[PDB]
Amino acid sequence: RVLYCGDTSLETAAGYLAGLMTSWQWEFDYIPSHVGLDVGELLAKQDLVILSDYPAERMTAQAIDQLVTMVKAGCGLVMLGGWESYHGLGGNWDQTLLAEVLPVDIKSADDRINFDQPTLAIPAAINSVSHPILQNLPWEDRPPTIGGLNRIAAKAKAQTLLMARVWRPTFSLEHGKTTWEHADHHPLLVVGEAGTGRVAAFASDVAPHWVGGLVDWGDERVTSQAPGAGAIEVGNLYSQFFRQMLEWVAKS
Amino acid sequence: RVLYCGDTSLETAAGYLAGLMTSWQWEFDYIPSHVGLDVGELLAKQDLVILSDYPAERMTAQAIDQLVTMVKAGCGLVMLGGWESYHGLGGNWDQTLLAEVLPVDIKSADDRINFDQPTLAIPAAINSVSHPILQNLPWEDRPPTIGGLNRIAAKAKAQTLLMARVWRPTFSLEHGKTTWEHADHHPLLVVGEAGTGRVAAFASDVAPHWVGGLVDWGDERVTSQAPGAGAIEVGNLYSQFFRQMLEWVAKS
Ligand SMILES: [Ca+2]
Ligand SMILES: [Ca+2]
Ligand SMILES: [Cl-]
Ligand code: NA
Numbered sequence: 065r066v067l068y069c070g071d072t073s074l075e076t077a078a079g080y081l082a083g084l085m086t087s088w089q090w091e092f093d094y095i096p097s098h099v100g101l102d103v104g105e106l107l108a109k110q111d112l113v114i115l116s117d118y119p120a121e122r123m124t125a126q127a128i129d130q131l132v133t134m135v136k137a138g139c140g141l142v143m144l145g146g147w148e149s150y151h152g153l154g155g156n157w158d159q160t161l162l163a164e165v166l167p168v169d170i171k172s173a174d175d176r177i178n179f180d181q182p183t184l185a186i187p188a189a190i191n192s193v194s195h196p197i198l199q200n201l202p203w204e205d206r207p208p209t210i211g212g213l214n215r216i217a218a219k220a221k222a223q224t225l226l227m228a229r230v231w232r233p234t235f236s237l238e239h240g241k242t243t244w245e246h247a248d249h250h251p252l253l254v255v256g257e258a259g260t261g262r263v264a265a266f267a268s269d270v271a272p273h274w275v276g277g278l279v280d281w282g283d284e285r286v287t288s289q290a291p292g293a294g295a296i297e298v299g300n301l302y303s304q305f306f307r308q309m310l311e312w313v314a315k316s
Numbered sequence: 317r318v319l320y321c322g323d324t325s326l327e328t329a330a331g332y333l334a335g336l337m338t339s340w341q342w343e344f345d346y347i348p349s350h351v352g353l354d355v356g357e358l359l360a361k362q363d364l365v366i367l368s369d370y371p372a373e374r375m376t377a378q379a380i381d382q383l384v385t386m387v388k389a390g391c392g393l394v395m396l397g398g399w400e401s402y403h404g405l406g407g408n409w410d411q412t413l414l415a416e417v418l419p420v421d422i423k424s425a426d427d428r429i430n431f432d433q434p435t436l437a438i439p440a441a442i443n444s445v446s447h448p449i450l451q452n453l454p455w456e457d458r459p460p461t462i463g464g465l466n467r468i469a470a471k472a473k474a475q476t477l478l479m480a481r482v483w484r485p486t487f488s489l490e491h492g493k494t495t496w497e498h499a500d501h502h503p504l505l506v507v508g509e510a511g512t513g514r515v516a517a518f519a520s521d522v523a524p525h526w527v528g529g530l531v532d533w534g535d536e537r538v539t540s541q542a543p544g545a546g547a548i549e550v551g552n553l554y555s556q557f558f559r560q561m562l563e564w565v566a567k568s
Contacts, residue, residue: 076328178532178549182434182461182483190489207487207494208432211462211529229494231434234457237442242459242481272524277463279525280387280430299432 066092069101069214070148074293076246077271078119080279081144082290084303094140094292097122103130110134112314116144116259116270123287135165136259139224140313146269151175157171167222167256168265169258175215177250178274179295182231183210185252185268188224195225195309197253197264201301210252211276213267216255224257227268237298245252270306278302317363318344318566321353322370326545330533333368333396334542336555349374349400355382356459362386362567368396368522372408380414385415387446388511392565398521402466403427419474419508420517427467429502434483435462437504437520437530440476447477448564449505449516453557460553463528465502465519467524474508480519507564514565522558530554 065130066085071078073096089215093110095101103126113131113206122130135141143166149153151171156171157163184207187193191228193203194217210228218224230248235241253267269275283300317335318542322328324414337344345362347353349370355378359365365383375383385469387393400407409415410422436459439445445455469478470476487493506517520542521527534553539545562568 118435178551179530180460180532180534180553181458182529184434184485186487186494187489193489199404204487204489206433207485209434211463212532223490231494233436233459235436235438235456237439237445237456242436242438242483242496242498244494246494273527273531275525276528277430277432277434282432285495287356299430301432 065110065316066090066114067095067097067110068092068114068116069087069109069122070097070099070116071146071271072117074290078299079290079293080296081114081116081270081306082293083288083296084298084306085186086290087288087303088284088307100124101127103127107116107131107134108240110139110143112140112310114142114144114310115149117146117148119148119154121313122159132165135261138260140262141165142264142266142310142313144270145214145267146274147176150216152214161205165258165261166265167254168216168217168251169219170216177215178212179210179230179231184229184231185210186227186229188227197255197312198225201305208275209277209283210268212269212274213250213252214316216251216254216265216267217266218251218258219256222254222256224251224254228252262308264313264314266309281305318342318361318366319346319347319363319364320346320366320368322349322368323398323523324349324369326542328355329369331545332527332540332548333366333524333558335540335546335548336550336558338539339540339555340543342475346526352376353379353445355379359383360386362391364392364394364562366394366396367401369398369400371400371406372412375412380412384413384417387513387515390512392514392567393417394562394565395518396519396522397466397519398526399422399428401528402468416425417510417515418517419471419506419515420468420503421471422468428464431462433483433485436481436483437462438479438481440479447563449507450477451560453553454527458533460533460538461529462519462520464527465504466519468503468506468519470503470506471508471551474506476503476506478505480504514567516561516565518561533557
């Protein structure tokens with residue numbers, strides 16, 4: 065019982081996670097970014113709610129209060145970054161009561177960071193890799209790249225699992241050599257609890273343009289097509305990482 | 317006088333280049349990826365044709381002949397990489413007489429390379445940066461990242477201006493340290509002539525998911541919205557690079 069809201073439409077960006085969930089044989093309801101969500105039965109019957117490029121204004125205030133209560137009673141909640149997540153440009157989730165249950169502080173000014181140079185997903189601490197979301201993935205052998213994120217900060221009682229390290233390489237024409245220098249870092253995946261529900265904030269996107277190299281993570285390809293969506297072909301480690309994220313939040 | 321074919325639709329990926337061209341005050345015609353192109357007035361009146369995720373099967377054999385003759389008579393042609401460019405998966409341009417005028421050899425089997433780790437665009441030689449396309453861009457100080465490319469090879473009489481250098485960083489949780497090792501390199505931008513026309517083969521995409529960090533290249537932002545397309549917000553250097561590429565090919 066999963067509700068996925070946003071990423072424009074199935075025929076566009078939502079096709080990625082909808083396709084992943086179809087390949088996992090999960091059942092889900094889907095709401096596109098231009099359709100609203102009100103209090104009631106559709107919201108009531110979920111065990112996992114995923115908000116990704118779904119603007120705050122799409123939810124009525126009473127829908128938000130229902131969701132908040134449901135998460136405290138055990139429902140999983142995950143937010144995935146994008147231009148209409150967190151604060152973004154039209155996300156505005158900092159202005160909602162849902163901010164109280166998310167494990168990150170959200171800015172009240174534009175929080176979008178777009179990377180024109182290489183940025184790697186890296187575990188936050190040496191034992192972050194023991195977390196079920198991070199297990200059995202090649203963080204050391206093959207750190208994946210991301211394209212951007214919303215700038216968010218872990219709350220005091222939250223656990224940061226992944227960072228994003230920004231690199232600013234330079235190239236010498238004369239010597240034919242690239243110099244790697246590191247420049248900034250940002251929280252990338254933060255998890256926590258609200259009552260008996262689990263919550264996760266992923267700062268980057270599951271779909272373009274911010275998902276970046278992560279969408280192709282691995283040496284193999286996973287192909288799928290959610291009903292109503294375009295066919296996808298994506299990395300095996302991409303599928304595995306998002307599956308482990310959503311399974312943990314859902315307490316699968 | 318510009319004809320731009322492919323990248324699905326204006327409301328989706330074609331909005332990027334359409335938005336750039338609108339921001340440059342250029343006029344253009346546009347054909348979506350599902351719409352065929354036959355011999356006609358629409359093709360005849362052009363000075364620049366851009367093919368980008370436009371499958372070979374959409375162009376009639378007579379249209380291909382018209383386009384080849386026009387290019388040899390002075391019309392510029394640019395192919396931009398993607399899954400339905402070059403050979404790709406459904407591109408199949410190697411099968412066409414258009415292959416004759418392009419400045420690269422196109423494979424007869426899947427040529428798609430997707431980068432899950434950092435890949436940098438780099439000038440191919442010391443004097444490449446003197447080429448009009450590459451002038452006044454910070455190739456040394458800020459080499460941009462791309463997400464993938466079609467594997468293509470420069471024809472003998474053509475000039476390779478940019479390479480893509482594949483990096484395979486590894487991360488040590490113990491040392492808190494990233495080690496940067498490079499691997500392969502691929503042609504990224506190859507230019508030539510066919511009769512009196514100029515031709516260009518860019519191996520990566522102008523739009524997601526392969527354009528990667530290049531779409532955000534620069535410290536500043538360009539905003540635009542082509543008629544019928546979505547609003548875009550992209551890098552200043554991204555705009556400048558694609559403008560210079562297309563102006564060179566068009567002899568603008
Ligand atoms: Ca998104
Ligand atoms: Ca494309
Ligand atoms: Cl939809
Ligand atoms: Na250590």
